[PDB]
């Protein structure tokens, strides 16, 4: 679960780092689904990562 959350968020971070925060949000949404708490996983993105990626991942997840 955590490894799948770590792999999907890393895949989402690759698309987010290129300027496509919304495109990587969909992959990070699966990471939130892979994680035990999708809200807590998305809370890290809001606290640390860019807000555009975190805001789009909340609707996707």
């Amino acid at each position: 679960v955590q490894k799948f959350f770590l792999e999907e968020i890393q895949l989402g971070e690759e698309l987010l780092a290129q300027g496509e925060y919304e495109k990587g949000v969909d992959h990070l949404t699966n990471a939130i689904a892979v994680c035990g708490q999708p809200q807590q996983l998305l809370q890290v993105l809001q606290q640390t990562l860019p807000p555009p990626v975190f805001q789009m991942l909340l609707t996707k997840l």
Partner: protein
């Protein structure tokens, strides 16, 4: 888990703050806290994750870590430097040393020790002084920075600020009631530090304070420290201050010329000669009751003539650049004295240049004088010994003869240095015991190279007898290596390192002549190492029996002739003929063997494991222990 610990270390290393937040969520707190309290021992550091987050300026990582799992920022950890390993007490000290104001201010906002002393009490303010960030200095002095903290080397942070051209940090520190006369361990101060480093503006900034001026450990004003290096701006500023009498000013100008005479980094004969002439013109400005420098006899080896006492003398010998360098180094030596460490480094540079110009005798004499000065100062003198064996190797490779009395003198000097090295090995506990062992090994290697060089050339019978006396004294000291190799074992083994310079042209261990010299001077051939191998075991373990068979046959013949029990055994209890790993050496040893009742009986006793204990004479007990 250990994978979680490594993943914490990676997240703090490359700034993966999202992975760190995933670590600090979705699980418990005690185990994750323990895992984030340390990193893996990679790269020689057990540092805090916050320390390595401050190393690359990742304030977001440490901020999110403190927000999720609040940990004390005073968590210590080993921190590496360019050539030093000092275990950092806190992350903000490393941030100040790496120039990251954001991590420092965030850690102070979270609540932290502003003056958390490091292993060598390195203040974060001191680290900022090292880096030169003025904003960090201002923030810590707002947060009650400890400006009076000095190292074991008595290095107050003003000295560290004055090390480099961080003049803003220096002026702000002296604005914040610093100590411009803070003494170091060797008597140094920011005045001498800026005189050596050539920061004239820092000198003027301290002159704005003008609290006091103090001498160093050897004893001389910072004018002499400025004249000790090629820092003529500070010298001219301090002569403009003119807080000295005439003669001291004249010899300070002489030292300023002398430092520029034989410096590797910058060197011009014109400026050195002009400074010497201006100093002597100031000397002759007295006229009546003229002050003159004290006359000293010329050293026969180092130089050939004394100083010049007339202006027309150096006006004439200006073209004699070698004489100008000799006179400059002579006045430098007679002013600084033998106690000053830096008296021999320009001598070393000039000798290296002379060797590059094939002035071999001048180089040997200069380096002998430098070694004499360094040994009288009781310093670490292995690097110059290695270079000096290197210049022997270069001369022998160029088919140039050497001076046998010089060989004997430097062999006596190396024996005395090995005595000093043994004393400081047996006296020190754990300070630089590894460095001391490496120094002892290098000294033994250089002595072996010197013996090989002496055997390569031809020497007079009296000089050869004196060399044999010195080698006999050193082997009477019986030096041992880390594994217990003696000098004979070191000469026997092909595993003995040889320097990458021209020494490879002359050092070809196993060397038969060196072994012959040791055996005639009386080396303990029967001596063994910690592994139990003797000289015969190592020489029969040689792996090129035919490429250089002359050396192997000569050393086998010499070892048998001096007398070594060929049946003696190592810790694994096998003879050199059993440890042959070579047909040629095995047959040579077999035809060089010798029958004996005692040896065969001891071999039978050892093989049959009869209770030899307490049934034989004690000498027979070590005899059985040989077998």
């Amino acid at each position: 888990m250990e994978g979680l610990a490594g993943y914490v270390y990676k997240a703090a290393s490359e700034g993966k703050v999202l992975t760190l937040a995933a670590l600090l969520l979705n699980r418990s707190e005690s185990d994750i806290r323990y895992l984030l309290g340390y990193v893996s021992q990679q790269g020689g550091q057990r540092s805090t994750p916050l320390i390595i987050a401050a190393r690359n300026g990742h304030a977001k990582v440490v901020r999110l870590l403190l927000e999720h799992y609040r940990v004390q920022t005073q968590q210590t950890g080993t921190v590496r430097f360019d050539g030093y390993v000092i275990d950092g007490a806190t992350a903000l000290w490393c941030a100040a040393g790496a120039g990251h104001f954001e991590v420092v201010k965030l850690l102070v906002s979270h609540g932290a020790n502003v003056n958390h002393t490091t292993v060598t009490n390195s203040t974060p303010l001191r680290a900022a002084c090292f880096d030169g960030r003025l904003d960090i200095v201002k923030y810590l002095v707002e947060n009650n920075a400890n400006i009076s903290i000095a190292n074991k080397y008595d290095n107050t942070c003003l000295m560290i600020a004055a090390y480099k051209g961080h003049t803003d940090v220096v002026r702000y520190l002296l604005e914040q009631r610093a100590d411009p006369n803070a003494k170091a361990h060797c008597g140094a101060t920011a005045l001498h530090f800026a005189a050596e480093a050539g920061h004239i503006d820092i000198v003027k900034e301290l002159i704005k304070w003008r609290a006091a001026i103090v001498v160093n450990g050897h004893g001389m004003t910072p004018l002499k420290v400025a004249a000790e290096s090629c820092k003529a701006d500070v010298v001219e500023l301090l002569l403009s201050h003119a807080d000295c009498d005439r003669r001291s000013r004249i010899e300070a100008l002489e030292l300023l010329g002398a430092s520029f005479a034989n410096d590797r980094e910058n060197y011009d004969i014109i400026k050195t000669y002009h400074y010497l002439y201006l100093a002597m013109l100031e000397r002759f400005q007295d006229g009546d009751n003229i002050l003159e420098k004290e006359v000293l006899p010329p050293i026969h080896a180092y130089g050939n003539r004394t100083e010049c006492r007339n202006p027309q003398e150096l006006e004439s010998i200006r073209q004699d650049r070698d004489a100008l360098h000799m006179e400059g180094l002579i006045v430098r030596e007679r002013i600084l004295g033998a106690d000053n460490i830096d008296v021999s480094h320009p001598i070393i540079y000039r000798g290296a240049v002379y060797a590059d110009n094939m002035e071999f005798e001048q180089c040997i004499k200069l380096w002998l004088h430098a070694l004499h000065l360094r040994q009288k100062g009781n310093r670490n003198t292995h690097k110059d010994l290695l270079r000096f064996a290197q210049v022997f190797s270069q001369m022998i490779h160029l088919n140039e003869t050497v001076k046998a009395p010089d060989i004997e003198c430097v062999l006596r000097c190396s024996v005395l240095e090995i005595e000093q090295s043994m004393n400081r090995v047996k006296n020190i506990s754990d300070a630089d015991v590894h460095n001391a062992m490496d120094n002892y090994e290098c000294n033994l290697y250089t002595f072996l190279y010197l013996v090989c060089i002496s055997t390569k050339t031809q020497c007079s019978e009296e000089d050869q007898c004196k060399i044999n006396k010195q080698i006999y004294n050193l082997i009477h000291l019986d030096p041992r290596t880390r594994e217990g190799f003696t000098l004979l074992h070191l000469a026997v083994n092909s595993n003995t390192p040889v320097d990458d310079f021209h020494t490879n042209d002359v050092c070809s261990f196993p060397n038969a002549l060196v072994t012959k010299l040791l055996l005639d001077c009386g080396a303990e051939v029967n001596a063994v190492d910690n592994e139990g191998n003797s000289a015969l075991h190592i020489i029969v373990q040689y792996n090129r029996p035919i490429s250089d068979f002359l050396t192997l046959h000569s050393i086998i013949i010499s070892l048998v002739e001096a007398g070594a029990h060929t049946d003696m055994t190592n810790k694994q209890n096998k003879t050199p003929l059993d440890k042959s790993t070579t047909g040629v050496s095995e047959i040579l040893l077999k035809t060089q063997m010798k029958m004996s009742l005692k040896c065969l009986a001891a071999r039978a006793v050892r093989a049959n494991d009869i209770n030899y204990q307490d049934q034989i004479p004690r000498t027979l007990e070590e005899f059985v222990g040989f077998h």
